């Protein structure tokens, strides 16, 4: 039994799964594609020449496959998860000393999910916001702030943490955040006489529940949102 090109490089499993994080630097290891040889080791069939056939979202040359070891890396083209959430990499490792012919060889499947980081600041969609209160009013959800984050709906990079810039000194309000829609649900805890004809003007600073990433911290300059509540 010689090491002729008589068989195929046996894979570990057909539909590979792995993951890498958004905005990773170049040459970051994503996986090592596991495969073995059905012939003897230290031979030409042991030279498992891994070979990407098709990126299914093919346009940016994002991933790099090391043809000697099967290690899959990230190129200098930086991943942005918000335009491609997942990549399918039909790879096809070939035995022999690299002869590229039409002899069919085993094809694996590589599915790569990209892990979102909080590289987006939430933005307040509405621009005029107003609420109304009367006598003896408490636990009123009069206004909801609509925010818009782009980082993986349902994640802590996407939920909005609200805080009071100014105006809520007596402890009138307390903001809870809906997770189904990422809304700015305010509440009312202190009762104000409407016949006092006063004002309850205040403002809110909006940010994600998780902390921001590298590149958008130190650029995050929050302008307060002047919510006006007539009494």
């Amino acid at each position: 039994v010689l090491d002729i090109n008589d068989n195929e490089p046996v894979f570990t499993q057909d539909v590979f799964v792995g993951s890498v994080e958004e905005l990773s630097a170049a040459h970051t290891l994503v996986m090592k594609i596991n495969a073995t040889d059905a012939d003897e080791p230290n031979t030409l069939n042991s030279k498992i020449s891994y070979r990407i056939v098709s990126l299914e979202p093919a346009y940016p040359p994002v991933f790099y496959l090391n043809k000697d070891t099967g290690e899959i890396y990230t190129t200098s083209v930086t991943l942005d998860r918000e335009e491609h959430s997942s990549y399918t990499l039909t790879v096809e490792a070939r035995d022999g000393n690299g002869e590229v012919t039409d002899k069919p060889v085993k094809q694996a499947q590589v599915q790569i999910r990209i892990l979102d980081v909080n590289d987006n600041i939430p933005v307040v969609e509405n621009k005029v916001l107003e609420g109304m209160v009367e006598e003896n009013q408490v636990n009123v959800e009069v206004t909801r702030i609509k925010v818009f984050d782009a980082d993986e709906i349902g994640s802590d990079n996407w939920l909005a943490n609200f805080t009071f810039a100014s105006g809520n000194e007596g402890g009138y309000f307390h903001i809870e955040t809906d997770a189904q829609t990422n809304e700015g649900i305010v509440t009312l805890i202190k009762e104000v006489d409407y016949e006092e004809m006063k004002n309850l003007d205040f403002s809110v600073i909006v940010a994600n529940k998780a902390a921001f990433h590298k590149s958008i911290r130190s650029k995050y300059k929050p302008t307060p949102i002047p919510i006006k509540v007539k009494v």
Binding site: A207, A211, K214, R217, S218, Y220, K221, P222
Partner: protein, 198 residues
Amino acid sequence: DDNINTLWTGVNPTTANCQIMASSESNDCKLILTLVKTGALVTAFVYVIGVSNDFNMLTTHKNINFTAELFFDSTGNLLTSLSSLKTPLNHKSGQNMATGALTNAKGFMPSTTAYPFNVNSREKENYIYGTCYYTASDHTAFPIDISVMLNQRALNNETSYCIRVTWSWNTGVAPEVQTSATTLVTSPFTFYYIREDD
């Protein structure tokens, strides 16, 4: 000798040599300064390292403004009792300050011809601006605005040259929190000025 072309605080002094804040009762930070004679210019190379807990606590606030005063006599020697830096500068001996006297210290000073005292028609020539950074605990760089001010004030008849460096930021969030605040280290800053004659 290329050692006498440099006037500087030492590299990583064993103790704090600067008292930036007046609330501190002693030296509260390490000030690293380096002045190198570059032809007719001085390549000035400055940054601070926080030491005291009150000083390092500054990273937890959003509106920070601290300054270093350097007042120098007619010969160029630092006036330690008036300046922020309480240890006089010296020449280069490895990574350490030299121990002898100062050989032509006056050549390192901001020139009075280029930077005059109390001339309102020529006020704008005394100002130098720039930017350094503070690397956060999660390796985020926060830009810090620096204003350098040359030969503005003589607090007495003794002061002949003045260098004021002021670090300041107005960020959206604090760089750190109370648990994550470790040390206030600013990235190095380099500026130039026309130097006084020897």
